[PDB]
Amino acid sequence: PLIRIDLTSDRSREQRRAIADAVHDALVEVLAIPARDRFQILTAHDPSDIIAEDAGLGFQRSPSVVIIHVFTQAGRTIETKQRVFAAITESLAPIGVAGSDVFIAITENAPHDWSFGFGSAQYVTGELAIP
Template sequence: MPFVRIDLIRGRRPDEVRAIADATHQALLDVLDIPERNRFQIITEHDADHVIALDAGLGFERSDRLVMIQIFTQSGRTTEVKQRLFHTIAEQLEPLGISGEDVFIGIVENGPQDWSFGFGRAQYTEGDLAVPGR
């Protein structure tokens, strides 16, 4: 059950924003094999001068088409799966006019005890939901 935050530079049309969210979710479905309704996304648009994303010394420039994605998910996925997810997200965003240098992704992992889906309860640890991958 990933929780995804997508940060964009302000200026895209609403249909473009939705297409980015849809493409990101499709990559999660394809690679992580999650249920389709496990969709939890927050999309935030920022003024251009409120986003700083350099190249970390890799030798490329980013544009105002930058998409920064944080994926909060349960631990346990292999490095290979994460790399495939990174690749698939970038591949899904490319037809939307977002080039590879403008795709920045980070994964934050935690455990089933760290999630509440409502009512102030921990549904994984209380047994209401099956823990993914177990």
């Protein structure tokens, strides 16, 4: 999967990488993807450029929101997705991201929508196995 992580500049570079390592670890744990199946883009913003309210659920976030947008091939069940959300958030708590401050989205495509390099579609050529 390709993960876009958008967070705020008040967080140190060290914590940004901890955040990314945690998100990856969680995905490996729950999806059982190769440990080197890691593709992430981290973008830091001024806090005012991320606006994430509470959807009417009655809680408050700090300004240090972390938005995690997972682009991944279809196939995973609802329950597997619930576990993804849980593991990501649980992995982040001990490195300093509160549960209230994490927002996660999943967007799906097919195995034939990926190229990992060299102009090749490795799921189509079978150079990479499909989960």
